[PDB]
UniProtKB/Swiss-Prot annotation, chain B:
Family, per entry: Belongs to the bacterial flagellin family.
Full-length numbering of the shown residues: 5 to 53 of 488
Task performed by this protein: Flagellin is the subunit protein which polymerizes to form the filaments of bacterial flagella.
Lineage summary: Bacteria, Pseudomonadati, Pseudomonadota, Gammaproteobacteria, Pseudomonadales
Post-translational modification: Phosphorylated on tyrosine residue(s).
Subcellular location: Secreted; Bacterial flagellum
Organism: Pseudomonas aeruginosa (strain ATCC 15692 / DSM 22644 / CIP 104116 / JCM 14847 / LMG 12228 / 1C / PRS 101 / PAO1)
Signal peptide: none
Protein origin, superkingdom: Bacteria
UniProt protein name: B-type flagellin
């Protein structure tokens, strides 16, 4: 039981670090969506 | 959770909204939707020409 709870705690910690990593990835992807939105903005403005 | 608070997303949002508010303030005080500033460089060329 002690081995189980210790491995469980370290696994929950690793899962928390993974959640944070994926959160940074999601933020970067949202920034990419904003950049592509601005790209389409200037592209359709380039119809002129 | 005491060494830091994750509420700084609200700080980011208030910063962005203050930028938007200053831009709209400029737009209304000069009467120009596109400012004499950087915004809409193509529209800026059209306006200068």
């Amino acid at each position: 039981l002690s081995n189980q709870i210790s491995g469980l705690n370290v696994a929950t910690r690793n899962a928390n670090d993974g959640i944070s990593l994926a959160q940074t990835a999601e933020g970067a992807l949202q920034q990419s969506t904003n950049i592509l939105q601005r790209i389409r903005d200037l592209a359709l403005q380039s119809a002129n | 959770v005491n060494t830091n608070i994750a509420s700084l997303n609200t700080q980011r949002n208030l910063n962005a909204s203050s930028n938007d508010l200053n831009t709209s303030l400029q737009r209304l005080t000069t009467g120009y939707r596109i400012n004499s500033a950087k915004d809409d460089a193509a529209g800026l060329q059209i306006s200068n020409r």
